[PDB]
Design a protein around this ligand. Structure first.
Ligand code: F90
Length: 330
């Protein structure tokens, strides 16, 4: 089997991407944030505290004839963000772009934090990291990908995020028309539960490439590119008037600037992030200070190849017995 679903930015800054997901019988379609940095499929629901729902579409398990409460199971998760949610668990039929899983754990939120409430465009998350990170207790549950894998033509999914435009998540096949040149594969460590890999270096603008190992995760659920302080300083030093602002919470730059590109290495190959991808707009409405898309990972504890980086590539999440990651230009 295979599936193919369009992913759409939630706003003009590509702050996140939403993908329609069919849950239950008859289908209830929710717009979920596909997150290769976590491993829980959770949704806004008829059980979510009423004051914590503001515009989202909810899952109502009592209206699904295939929903079954997963007795005694609960979940609770927090994001690298600082947000969180928690609740109980159903199993139900879940379909993504024509690919169907029966018996998927669907985590029903009873509580969501304010950032979730405040974002009416995201109806929940669909985690695509390794199932060892799933938070359901006392019986941990598998991700949508892990449940589907054996049925797929090939045990892979691909992320093709757009810049200010829709893109695609495919399951079970590699669309050879969706990238240019070849896909370069690179090793993955699953020891922390993430799609963790090591970039071979970087360049800033038309600058020479610096060969240096940068360990980090491929995370569709993170908006920005978080890299070591040395790398980030080298980038922003090429932008007149750019500065790290403790009050804003990162690097800002004059909105009148033209940003340089940023290149990262994948083995001997190179992915180029155009400068415009690194502009996240005024720090506040009407400001002429703009927020940077490359930020330091120093307070975080891990480097994160978030949407800013991934959207410059066609990315293969290879879930074979030994997982790997593939990157191509597009
Ligand atoms: N994508 C996700 N849900 S969490 C990403 C993240 C942020 C911080 C650290 Cl330490 C690990 C992962």
């Amino acid at each position: 089997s295979t599936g193919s679903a369009t992913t759409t930015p939630i706003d003009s800054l590509d702050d996140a991407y939403i993908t329609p997901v069919q849950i239950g019988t008859p289908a209830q379609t929710l717009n979920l944030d596909f997150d290769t940095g976590s491993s829980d499929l959770w949704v806004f629901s008829s059980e979510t505290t009423a004051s914590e729902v503001d515009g989202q579409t909810i899952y109502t398990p009592s209206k699904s004839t295939t929903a079954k409460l997963l007795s005694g199971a609960t979940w609770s998760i927090s994001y690298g963000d600082g947000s969180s949610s928690s609740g109980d668990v159903y199993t139900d039929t879940v379909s993504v772009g024509g690919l169907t899983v029966t018996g998927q754990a669907v985590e029903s939120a009873k509580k969501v934090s304010s950032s979730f409430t405040e974002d009416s465009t995201i109806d929940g998350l669909l985690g695509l990291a390794f199932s060892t990170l799933n938070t359901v207790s006392p019986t941990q549950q598998k991700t949508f990908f892990d449940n589907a894998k054996a049925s797929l033509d090939s045990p892979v999914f691909t992320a093709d995020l757009g810049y200010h435009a829709p893109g695609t998540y495919n399951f079970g096949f590699i669309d050879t028309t969706a990238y240019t040149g070849s896909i370069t594969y690179t090793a993955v460590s699953t020891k922390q539960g993430f799609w963790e890999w090591t970039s071979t270096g970087y360049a800033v603008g038309s600058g020479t490439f610096k060969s240096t190992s940068i360990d980090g995760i491929a995370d569709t659920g993170t908006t920005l590119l978080y890299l070591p302080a040395t790398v980030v300083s080298a980038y922003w030093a090429q932008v007149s008037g750019a500065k790290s602002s403790s009050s804003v919470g990162g690097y800002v730059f004059p909105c009148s600037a033209t940003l340089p590109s940023f290149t990262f290495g994948v083995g001997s190959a190179r992915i180029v992030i155009p400068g415009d991808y690194i502009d996240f707009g005024p720090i506040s409405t009407g400001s002429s200070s703009c927020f940077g898309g490359i930020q330091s990972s120093a307070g975080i504890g891990i480097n994160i190849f978030g949407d800013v980086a991934l959207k410059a590539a066609f990315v293969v999440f290879n879930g074979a017995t030994t997982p790997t990651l593939g990157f191509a230009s597009k």
